[PDB]
Write a protein that binds this ligand. Structure first.
Ligand code: NAD
Ligand code: NAD
Ligand code: NAD
Ligand code: NAD
Lengths: 338, 338, 338, 338
């Protein structure tokens, strides 16, 4: 029977994850039975239904009362406590917590759900410290059913890793530089305001904002042969969703642009089907909203110089594509449950 | 000698106020000696100098250490405590606190600065309850030197009131409706997220967001004859700064557009000089950045029907113009410090 | 059998109209057989399918060659000539031309399609001079089957007129002021550049840009009792689509907000069904994308002072809603093709 | 005495060039005496003074009549003819034409100014065909005084070339990939509309838009040893001005990030002073508005892997910094006039 899931943090990723599940609900091993968030159920049902990016949820009615959010007859219990130790996970029989607050990414933070009664936690972000990290289509079959806390990495890592994996196997990646031109996120400020990062303090819709990213080093955890070989940065820019990765690799086997493209295309039809999509179309960021792939290779932009310097460019829907992956990782854990 | 001022909340209004004061510092009866804010002095010195809206501060060098921000040799002490009861106002000899956090606008909230030792508080927002409210150029000469807590109203009210006062005295305002088309503010969300107001919850730079405003009722507190005669709404739109008021009045004395324009132009040259600016130019919001007036009447947009229904439109820089008026109100209180 | 329609100008309105028709194609008396536009069929097929605002067209396959656009097997002939006198309207047997270029809105301009062979022209904009103007749900039943050139007015007029008509019949509108806070359009500039209107010359996505509008006077042509009683302005703001009308009326019959709301709700359920939608929800512009109504009354925003000064606020999707009404007007003309 | 200059095309670059000159007018060998543009002098004086990006021109009064634009007593003659063969260049004694329309970048196009009577033309864009290309601080001392038509290259080339030149001399560039994350320009569409490039057809303020750029190949013309070794792309993003270049080079001499930074910093103090600025500050795009350097190296973002794969990141103000360079190239030509 079903794995009972709770969502902790009903934010952009929490609510995209819930909409992904509501559309794949008929063939799932998961049942979302609870949400904890700092707001109330009426606010949250409103935001679940009325989304500036995804539009109005159509498939089922979404309603709320003091206690619950109702999404097409399914009643999802709600609570509101900032400290996960106090959560009613035992009383609700929660198996798996989708940890989407952004604030409990270390083992000590995420463990508080275990001590409140949950059996496992899936963190929708890179882990801090020693937390096993999975990227679906790259290393998710190495999942160890005895792990209690896992990470689904970041959106950028889920875009980059599959492409790196295909290029590494075909050409041998020796070193690699990435830049993601990335939509702003809720971590940034609307107008100039205090922040730990002096660049992310700055009005997000008016600026190109450079920032660091662990995505390129995190690829080394999911593809252990590349540990320490990749580095990169992020530029946040004034769009609200959809991002793009530009990756330049120094490879061992000399090649040309048509061959790099052919290798990716073959992978997108076979071993990376559903993970990498190969696009030959001249599209822009709006067109990739709602796309289900982790990475959409923009084949016209591929270029190679001197045999060994390879550049590829891939799109990702950082909210929705990432949430589809969280859901796939969760379904995978449900099918391998101990 | 000088009135010693502390800023509580070094946000958009706090930092605009500080820049206003640094440029009018030679003519001033105030001396800013302290800042309380939830962030540290190095962050705040960086944000003071580097502003997405105002640009790089040029007049003087701005530096910081653990304890202080230095703005052209002047040392501004810094502290960081969310609870104003704990603040060192007696120890720093603070006379006047500029209350710019947005969070202590009731008498009970603002009184915590008195009990920490400040002699007076000027709230940079409408007051809740019974707090005397002043709009410079409308009723600031009614200020009573024995008042310990005052409000400088909102940006919208400072734009609307002077125009209303001139139109009321010339034509007799019987009723009036206002809509402000207003730049987004820090109160709104960057991407759809929880908020007390379900409209302000929504991505601010992607949406037109209606909201309620007390600006129109607050005009009745500064022009007591009009209490209960005005109402209005706000539409937040995707610009970071500069706003516009549209005001439709039912008046007693029949008139036409040219005459309504002439009455405002006359007032802008005499009794409202420096408060209302009259513009015959066809400008857009960007052109009003840094403008010092509380209201800039856009004269081409004035229209009248049937003698008695009058529409006027006025611009305001909601951050900078408003902060100029906080500074004027403070200088006025300094000059009458009995 | 079918009325053969050609689209002249395959811009935002032309392409929205075509999508409207492709989704209502089974119930239709029209058949779109031709397009004239300044660009070629491959470009136009790409733009028809890939739309930043509407997303990717899903219902049918859309393809092109040198001569034609194919939308689900239906072949739409294409030509590219700036001068409508040269167009092959007789040769293609065109009955009705949808004039959507923005450039042939006078009788003399629009008559060039007649002289090229079309039997009638429907202008997707206000007409200049003496052109009969229809707003569906307000005066479209006065359409006269012998009229050869008609106007569907503007988006703003389609939003404002039905509401005015309901309020006039219930309360007696004596005078009225309108401001539309309107999404930017193709008529404006991306960055400051030359334009007939010095305000529209200015960077559209960075500014609030006031402009004149004939929408309020045009309400007098569709509701002849109100000719000369209404006036208004527009403020263009940095959203790409969806607009809002704010209307302040001086009325004869004293009233209050609840009653004004009840009169509009009643009309939305009966005589204005499908034209006015009544909303009690706290939504923002993004939520009205794709909405089929000409006006969506935002009921919480309704306010009344002194019995006789009434403010209402209504949303409209200026591209899609308006195009639905062009399609309805065209279906109406088809049904009465005497 | 003075070189008499005319501006053909009074667009973003034409008007930025004019403001650069008005501020450096006291030590110049150039005198701007005429403008040709498709609009009239009153429109153009308005746009010259009221700029959404640069703000209100302060230094001098700017006025216009039917014939002329006046900028602080200096009367600049205006004409309006799309075809440069008809221009009054002989009658106005024009020596140098600043060709800023974007439409006369080939030798045959630009020569029409010579045949109207001008002696030289400086194209504010890459040339098509065999036109000598200069980048100030890279190859401008190779100017040949007998050349009648020159190119100042693009904004991206002016940012990239100086940095490439310093890296090549210190490390030996073997191959190099660039991506510029670039503000939208007037070449793009405000809302989805026809364009030769199917990506630039798309709403520029709502999308990340990839496009090709000749900047990386054009570096090979100004640094002839690197011909054919560089390639790259552009991503247009929703900011109106200021751009950033990300450059990844494969170099011969093994190095680390601190050494790459030290070499650039030393060049910025000496041979590239005024061309490259070295910044150690954590700033965002808004902060670089109005910056006079061709390239501002963001030193914190530099990274190196395996000795030979080097990434650097540099900002540029694509309007203003580029126009300063156009002015410097023109002054250089004036000082070497034959
Ligand atoms: N593009 C993306 O948005 C994206 C993609 C991949 C991963 N992520 C990661 O997913 C996580 C969430 O990011 P997001 O974009 O949803 O941010 P968000 O701020 O929209 O969502 C966080 C939610 O958690 C709530 N919250 C905060 N602290 C809480 C607490 N102690 N208890 C309960 N609820 C709490 C917030 O109110 C909000 O509802 C972050 O770790 C982020 O790094 C984001
Ligand atoms: N257009 C405008 O921005 C505008 C105009 C007029 C009035 N106001 C009003 O001015 C006030 C502030 O507006 P803002 O736009 O500057 O907001 P903001 O969020 O930029 O500023 C608030 C500042 O105070 C800090 N803060 C919050 N709680 C605190 C506490 N308990 N102790 C100390 N510091 C705290 C924040 O960290 C921030 O630095 C509000 O009352 C607002 O309504 C704003
Ligand atoms: N919100 C709106 O967009 C809106 C709403 C209602 C009405 N309108 C009106 O509809 C009309 C078009 O608006 P739009 O927003 O679609 O503009 P747009 O610029 O997107 O569309 C015009 C189209 O016609 C083409 N064109 C221009 N001149 C031509 C000629 N001589 N021959 C053939 N084709 C030509 C353009 O290339 C473009 O494809 C205008 O009259 C406008 O006022 C627009
Ligand atoms: N970031 C930048 O804007 C940038 C930087 C470097 C180079 N450039 C180049 O500078 C040139 C101008 O670009 P821009 O951004 O000023 O564009 P723009 O469209 O703002 O300026 C072009 C001007 O020329 C006018 N014009 C067009 N055709 C004409 C003709 N036949 N005769 C006279 N005037 C005519 C236009 O009306 C406009 O005033 C282009 O070649 C562009 O590639 C642009």
């Amino acid at each position: 029977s079903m794995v009972r899931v709770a969502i902790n943090g009903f934010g952009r990723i929490g609510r995209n994850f819930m909409r992904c599940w509501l559309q794949r609900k008929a063939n799932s091993k998961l049942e979302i039975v609870g949400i904890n968030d700092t707001s109330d159920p009426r606010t949250n049902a409103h935001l679940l239904k009325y989304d500036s990016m995804l539009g109005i949820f159509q498939d089922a009615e979404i309603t709320a009362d003091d206690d619950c959010i109702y999404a097409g007859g399914h009643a999802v219990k709600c609570v509101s406590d900032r400290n996960p130790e106090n959560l009613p996970w035992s009383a609700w029989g929660i198996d798996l917590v989708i940890e989407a607050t952004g604030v409990f990414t270390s083992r000590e933070g995420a463990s508080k759900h275990l001590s409140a009664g949950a059996k496992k936690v899936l963190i929708t972000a890179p882990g801090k410290g020693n937390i096993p990290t999975y990227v679906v289509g790259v290393n998710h079959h190495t999942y160890d059913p005895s792990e209690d806390i896992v990470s689904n990495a970041s959106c950028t890592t889920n875009c980059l890793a599959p492409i790196v994996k295909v290029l590494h196997e075909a050409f041998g990646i020796q070193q690699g530089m990435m830049t993601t031109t990335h939509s702003y996120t809720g971590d940034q400020r609307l107008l100039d305001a205090s922040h730990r990062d002096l660049r992310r303090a700055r009005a997000a819709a008016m600026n190109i904002v450079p920032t660091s990213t662990g995505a390129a080093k995190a690829v080394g955890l999911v593809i252990p042969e590349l540990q320490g070989k990749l580095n990169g940065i992020a530029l946040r820019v004034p769009t609200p969703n959809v991002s793009v990765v530009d990756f330049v690799a120094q490879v061992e086997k000399p090649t040309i642009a048509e061959q790099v493209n052919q290798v990716i295309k073959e992978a997108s039809e076979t071993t990376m089907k559903g993970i990498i999509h190969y696009s030959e179309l001249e599209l822009v960021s709006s067109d990739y909203r709602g796309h289900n792939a982790s990475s959409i290779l923009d084949a016209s932009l591929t270029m190679v110089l001197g045999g060994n310097l390879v550049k590829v460019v891939a799109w990702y829907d950082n909210e929705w594509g990432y949430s589809q992956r969280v859901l796939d990782l969760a379904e995978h854990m449900a099918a391998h449950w101990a």
